Enzyme design. Structure first.
Site, PDB file in Angstrom:
ATOM      1  N   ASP A 244      22.242  -0.668  -1.206  1.00  0.00           N
ATOM      2  CA  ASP A 244      20.835  -1.056  -0.671  1.00  0.00           C
ATOM      3  C   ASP A 244      19.900  -1.658  -1.442  1.00  0.00           C
ATOM      4  O   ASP A 244      18.969  -2.052  -0.994  1.00  0.00           O
ATOM      5  CB  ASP A 244      20.404   0.390  -0.180  1.00  0.00           C
ATOM      6  CG  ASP A 244      18.813   0.572  -0.315  1.00  0.00           C
ATOM      7  OD1 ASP A 244      18.095  -0.516   0.232  1.00  0.00           O
ATOM      8  OD2 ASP A 244      18.313   1.271  -0.547  1.00  0.00           O
ATOM      9  N   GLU A 245      20.265  -1.904  -2.791  1.00  0.00           N
ATOM     10  CA  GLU A 245      18.937  -2.480  -3.640  1.00  0.00           C
ATOM     11  C   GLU A 245      19.640  -3.150  -4.807  1.00  0.00           C
ATOM     12  O   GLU A 245      20.800  -3.222  -5.129  1.00  0.00           O
ATOM     13  CB  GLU A 245      18.272  -1.362  -4.079  1.00  0.00           C
ATOM     14  CG  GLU A 245      18.811  -0.109  -4.619  1.00  0.00           C
ATOM     15  CD  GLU A 245      17.734   0.864  -5.021  1.00  0.00           C
ATOM     16  OE1 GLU A 245      17.629   1.557  -3.985  1.00  0.00           O
ATOM     17  OE2 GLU A 245      17.168   1.254  -6.017  1.00  0.00           O
TER      18      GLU A 245
ATOM     19  N   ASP B  19      14.805  -3.741  -2.062  1.00  0.00           N
ATOM     20  CA  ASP B  19      14.970  -2.455  -1.513  1.00  0.00           C
ATOM     21  C   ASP B  19      15.105  -2.259   0.114  1.00  0.00           C
ATOM     22  O   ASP B  19      13.909  -2.506   0.605  1.00  0.00           O
ATOM     23  CB  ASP B  19      14.090  -1.475  -2.070  1.00  0.00           C
ATOM     24  CG  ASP B  19      14.550   0.180  -2.145  1.00  0.00           C
ATOM     25  OD1 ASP B  19      15.603   0.286  -1.242  1.00  0.00           O
ATOM     26  OD2 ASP B  19      14.130   1.067  -2.760  1.00  0.00           O
TER      27      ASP B  19
HETATM   28  C1  LIG Z   1      18.268   9.134  -1.709  1.00  0.00           C
HETATM   29  C2  LIG Z   1      19.581   9.301  -1.119  1.00  0.00           C
HETATM   30  C3  LIG Z   1      19.844   7.861  -0.357  1.00  0.00           C
HETATM   31  N1  LIG Z   1      21.440   7.899   0.196  1.00  0.00           N
HETATM   32  C4  LIG Z   1      21.767   6.930   1.271  1.00  0.00           C
HETATM   33  C5  LIG Z   1      20.960   6.934   2.486  1.00  0.00           C
HETATM   34  C6  LIG Z   1      19.893   5.884   2.274  1.00  0.00           C
HETATM   35  O1  LIG Z   1      19.805   5.000   3.480  1.00  0.00           O
HETATM   36  C7  LIG Z   1      20.412   4.750   1.237  1.00  0.00           C
HETATM   37  C8  LIG Z   1      19.564   3.928   0.383  1.00  0.00           C
HETATM   38  O2  LIG Z   1      18.758   5.204  -0.549  1.00  0.00           O
HETATM   39  P1  LIG Z   1      17.245   4.818  -0.643  1.00  0.00           P
HETATM   40  O3  LIG Z   1      16.748   3.613  -0.992  1.00  0.00           O
HETATM   41  O4  LIG Z   1      16.797   6.108  -1.961  1.00  0.00           O
HETATM   42  N2  LIG Z   1      16.753   5.533   0.942  1.00  0.00           N
HETATM   43  P2  LIG Z   1      16.262   4.668   2.139  1.00  0.00           P
HETATM   44  O5  LIG Z   1      16.586   3.275   1.821  1.00  0.00           O
HETATM   45  O6  LIG Z   1      16.976   5.490   3.391  1.00  0.00           O
HETATM   46  O7  LIG Z   1      14.662   4.893   2.572  1.00  0.00           O
HETATM   47  P3  LIG Z   1      13.665   3.988   1.740  1.00  0.00           P
HETATM   48  O8  LIG Z   1      13.070   3.098   3.079  1.00  0.00           O
HETATM   49  O9  LIG Z   1      14.124   3.143   0.805  1.00  0.00           O
HETATM   50  O10 LIG Z   1      12.688   4.840   1.346  1.00  0.00           O
HETATM   51  O11 LIG Z   1      21.436   5.696   0.483  1.00  0.00           O
HETATM   52  C9  LIG Z   1      21.994   9.372   0.526  1.00  0.00           C
HETATM   53  O12 LIG Z   1      23.074   9.283   1.011  1.00  0.00           O
HETATM   54  N3  LIG Z   1      21.557  10.304  -0.146  1.00  0.00           N
HETATM   55  C10 LIG Z   1      20.492  10.343  -1.002  1.00  0.00           C
HETATM   56  O13 LIG Z   1      20.001  11.757  -1.379  1.00  0.00           O
HETATM   57 MG   LIG Z   2      16.328   1.822   0.467  1.00  0.00          MG
END
Ligand SMILES: Cc1cn([C@H]2C[C@H](O)[C@@H](COP(=O)(O)NP(=O)(O)OP(=O)(O)O)O2)c(=O)[nH]c1=O
Ligand SMILES: [Mg+2]
Length: 340
Positions: A103-104, A8
């Site tokens: 992202d994952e 992730d």
């Molecule tokens: C949850 C979410 C994510 N996304 C996009 C932006 C995030 O950078 C990306 C990856 O989602 P995530 O793994 O849920 N969040 P993140 O990678 O920014 O934060 P974290 O470090 O994983 O907590 O997807 C949105 O565009 N709207 C959303 O509601």
């Molecule tokens: Mg992420």
DNA sequence: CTAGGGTCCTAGGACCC
DNA sequence: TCTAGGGTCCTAGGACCC
């Protein structure tokens, strides 16, 4: 008996913007639509999270929480290229790769003998390689099943990992809030809460038949997860089933002329995307969506053999006439269902 | 003050034996 | 079909994820 890694990327969209433009690193930033575009936050960096800014938060609310928030529109090609590179890195370790988004991904490393079969060390080297080759960080979770590996990759964000061993699964489950289980969202959680069920611990003391009755196929998944049971295999062969495009207006539209003009702007976009994976534009269904100003939404979709602009327009006119009801419309969308 | 990609599940009636 | 009901398709909506 399996070893699952869930990898992730940290603050993925924001992290790419900060790599590319270092002056963003220590100020609060976010990717999302503006307040006048009626936007929503996609994601935020950690200086913005400190203020309470989260994904899916209305941009107006983010800005009240963090007035100096810098909003970026986002650059998909940049995120896409990072994603490809990362996936190509996963492939260095296994071919058992199930991507859940840019992202994952899940990795099944059960039959890998990189790092003496150590799923812990494999995860570590993947995070290191990603940092080395992309200057972005990732977190990871290692567990005997998918959903535990996914919960685990959050335990030590950012730039960390967490390992759940088979002997540790029972203690881990005992106090685990149901809401942390993938597919248990706010509605489910609240409904479970109103039954006295908050944790997997609570669900273990529950009758299966009874969960089957009040929740259907969902109640069985619930009972299983609570036992640590998750038999879903890592599937490296999933294919997209649909293609949709929609936009929200800065202002509610009230006249059909406005609606048709919006569809004409959407249609070429739907066509370019569909053609990317179906050059002949052959589909199973096509349809439309309208979202009103009280946020109810309706869709109208039908069997149809080939992407067609006029029939989408026609369909939207019927939907407009029949189910608008003098309400302002905030969104128009087009949709196709791909052939099997 | 509420995005835009999507996936998966439920359910009534049509349709077919 | 051998007859009261079983299985599968069409469609709309909802919950959920990222
Ligand atoms: C949850 C979410 C994510 N996304 C996009 C932006 C995030 O950078 C990306 C990856 O989602 P995530 O793994 O849920 N969040 P993140 O990678 O920014 O934060 P974290 O470090 O994983 O907590 O997807 C949105 O565009 N709207 C959303 O509601
Ligand atoms: Mg992420």
């Amino acid at each position: 008996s399996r070893k699952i890694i869930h990898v992730d990327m940290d603050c993925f969209f924001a992290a790419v913007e900060m790599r590319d433009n270092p002056a963003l690193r220590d100020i609060p930033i976010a990717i999302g639509g503006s307040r006048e575009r009626r936007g929503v936050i996609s994601t935020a960096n950690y200086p913005a999270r400190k203020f309470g800014v989260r994904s899916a938060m209305p941009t107006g609310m983010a800005l009240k929480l963090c007035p100096h928030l810098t909003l970026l529109p986002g650059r998909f090609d940049a995120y896409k290229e990072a994603s490809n590179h990362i996936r190509e890195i996963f492939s260095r370790y296994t071919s058992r790769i199930e991507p859940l988004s840019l992202d994952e991904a899940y990795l099944d490393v059960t039959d890998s003998v990189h790092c003496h079969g150590s799923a812990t060390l494999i995860a570590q080297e993947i995070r290191q390689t990603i940092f080395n080759e992309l200057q972005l960080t990732a977190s990871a979770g290692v567990a005997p099943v998918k959903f535990l590996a996914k919960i685990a990759s959050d335990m030590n964000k950012p730039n960390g990992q967490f390992v759940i061993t088979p002997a540790e699964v029972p203690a881990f489950l005992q106090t685990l809030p149901l809401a942390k289980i993938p597919g248990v969202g706010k509605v489910s959680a609240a409904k479970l809460e109103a039954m006295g069920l908050r944790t997997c611990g609570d669900v273990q003391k529950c009758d299966l038949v009874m969960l089957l009755k009040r929740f259907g196929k969902f109640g069985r998944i619930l009972w299983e997860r609570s036992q640590g049971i998750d038999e879903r295999d890592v599937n490296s062969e999933r294919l997209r089933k649909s293609v949709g495009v929609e936009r929200t207006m800065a202002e509610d539209i009230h006249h059909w002329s406005e609606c048709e003009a919006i569809i004409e702007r959407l249609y070429p976009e739907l066509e370019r995307r569909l053609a990317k994976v179906k050059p002949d534009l052959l589909i199973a269904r096509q349809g439309v969506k309208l979202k009103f100003d009280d946020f109810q939404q309706t869709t109208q979709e039908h069997v149809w053999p080939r992407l067609n602009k006029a029939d989408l327009i026609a369909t939207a006119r019927k939907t407009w006439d029949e189910r608008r009801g003098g309400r302002g419309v905030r969104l128009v969308g087009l949709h196709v269902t791909l052939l099997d």
